[model samples]
Target: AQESPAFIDPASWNTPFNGIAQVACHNCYEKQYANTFSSVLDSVRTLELDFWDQRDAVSGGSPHHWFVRHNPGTLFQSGNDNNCTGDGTGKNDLEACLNDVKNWSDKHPGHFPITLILDKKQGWSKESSGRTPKDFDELVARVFQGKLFTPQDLATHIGSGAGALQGNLKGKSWPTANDLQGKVLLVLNHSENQKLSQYAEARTSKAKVFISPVTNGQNDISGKVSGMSSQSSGYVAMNNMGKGDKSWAKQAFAYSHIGRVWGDDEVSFAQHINQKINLSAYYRFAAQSAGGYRIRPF
Candidate 1:
């Protein structure tokens, strides 16, 4: 496929009406049916990694300081089919998967830059980063090996890339495809300003107010987006529902689920999703990429 200037440039005159889609890995640490390295290699452009951390239990707290599970520890058991946990052993650390992604990124130079969403759900204490070697934040620094983007820097340089919604509406500035050439962009999800320092020093993460597969209830956002739009908060996100499907297609959108979910057949589910994409990509290609087709369950 024509990469680089062809797909990378948002306004290439020759391909002005082009379209692109970025698939995100929500709770990627868990099975999510794909490995971290696999996802990175297979065009999953973003890692929505949620690693629930556990502080040192022993007073010494020296040798082993932390263990990152895909979900809060309790959720992982035999019955869950290891949905939250990647494999059978059910033993996973953020560093393990992260290293895989880092190595993949280093090896593959032409792929689109990968964004890291640190799903750290707790506040950090001075020791939260852990004074010991195995400390959470310290390990991240080691694995990322200085590729990490700073809060202020990231705040200034994301959500501005190709295929992002028009304008400065998507919170902060984003990087263009060319801008991300040979680089891994970092974005830490943070909702509270109180523990900014504490958390940054720890895992340096953010985001929970908005996430997950998809929903079908119209007005489910309940105006939480525009509800605050009455002010200049400027935090509106794309909301869509796949026209008539009351529930999200399990194979394509459902990261974890059962009978109540959509298609049980993975083969057709993917085919259906591709059909949707081709339909939109075809028309959008003609109409100058007018709009996004993947509708979030409204």
Candidate 2:
């Protein structure tokens, strides 16, 4: 993962997600791209590794989040495109997951600010709520409290509600690595029940809160951008669409401020985010790449 494969040009990845050509791949641990642990090192700024909260049926004390699997609901896939299954031996505990990220952040200092789009599931159904997603939020917040980047922390601006951060995210351009030291940008799909709809208040870094995305979705970037219903619109979360569906491709120009653009693999026309690199540097590199990486002169 250190050097790019010769056949592929860096311009192949110059494509940016939301005006910044950075990618956070989906199912990153599948046989195709890389694992949850390794992906963190491969310049992926946002990681969408699905975690399932595993609870002992008989014991029922508290469930621990387990990594390297699909959402909790789809744990038992018959097989994957590569014949992978949950039975395979790649798994990590929440502790390890949190620790590894912190280790990386510590080593890199302000150069790295990670955003984890934890595609997590807590067991629940219409019958009754077994485990709420809040639990997942709590666990992450607790373990990663010190390193979180809240809506308040960023001199950057953006409504927590569904809106354009085009004019919002602070400064002339993106914040510098020095600006984001010891900060983790957390994008949560779910929202706070009733504290405040949009994050209108600037946080004072009490405990390092998170700046949840304005909105989220599974596989439609265009629809999210154009067809956002008043009640459902927030940040544009681009997931996997069909084979030829290029809407999932990040616009050469950013339609709006979004959390992450997830790709199934590196060459799937998705932004390849490098977590360890400075966000602005990554964007500049993309804008300056040999393969016409710069969609527009930033």
Candidate 3:
């Protein structure tokens, strides 16, 4: 039996462009360009990303409520000759979703001062439109409405707040700066915990900390942990807080589960604690990026 070249050199056979149009060949290069350009054009129209800001679209006033929802429209509009999805229908869908999120927050009191991480392409203005989409500003207006207590109003309705401590510690009132010192912190991946945990841990020198393992599609945390197990030390199941009887060397600090599958609203129990911590640097960084309409995670 004759051995094939594929069997003789499996590594070379498996290479991305092997047996296909090689990049170095002139004919192959032309074909590659055609394929690449066609693919890009086909995919461009269907890409939908979202943004969440608390401003109104028409009056530029703050919204009275918040909601959770997905961005509307397919990534592509076939009739538009590969242009970005437009027809302004997404604007309405975005508004409805925001209202839904506000309603969820309203029902979950004491969980406020939320932050949202939208999809990567959010807030970009199409060259044809000549104006950026009004999603973020409108969301802020819907939630704020000239209120003196923008954060407080959001906290009160959405159930998240940050301020000076005034109540007894036994009641589990708002956290003081001293409470955060030496606390254990766990950051949930893709849950907006990435930014929050780094800020919290840097300021409070007191707490011990561990980050949660990122889950693979197979339901394993193998990649993120070398020897992870059911009996792994320092593991804390976030939702089971207080009831699990797991002892922490310091208080476990978690943050909002924004964009989490389990929660309809973005705020989480730990958001209350995060609110107490000063996030001025994070806020400033976000603001500067926003002015430039930069995308998240670069």
Candidate 3 segments exceeding 4 Å error: 1-73, 76-89, 100-138, 143-171, 174-298
TM-score, model 1 to reference: 0.47
Q: Flag regions of model 2 displaced more than 4 Å.
A: 1-18, 30-39, 55-68, 71-91, 121-130, 152-178, 189-245, 248-253, 259-298
How many residue pairs clash per model? Answer: 12, 15, 42
Note the Cα lDDT for every prediction shown.
Answer: 0.35, 0.37, 0.23
Residue-by-residue lDDT tens digits, candidate 3, 184-210: 122222223332233222322221222
C-alpha lDDT of candidate 1 relative to the true structure: 0.35
TM-score, each model? Answer: 0.47, 0.52, 0.23
Q: In candidate 2, residue 247 scores what lDDT?
A: 38
Query: Which stretch of 10 consecutive residues in model 2 shows the poorest summed lDDT?
Result: 275-284
Per-residue lDDT over 34-122 for candidate 1, one digit per residue giving the tens place of the 0 to 100 score: 44334433534455454343522222222223344443334444212223224455444455666766777677765555556554544
lDDT tens readout by residue for model 2, 1-298: 2224332234323323233444344444444444335434444555544444453222222343443344333333321111123224323444455666666666664333466655443322221333333444456677777677653443233333223332333122334334454567655332231211221121122213333332233222333322334222232222223223333233312333443332223232222333211112121122223243322112
- For lDDT, the strongest prediction is 2
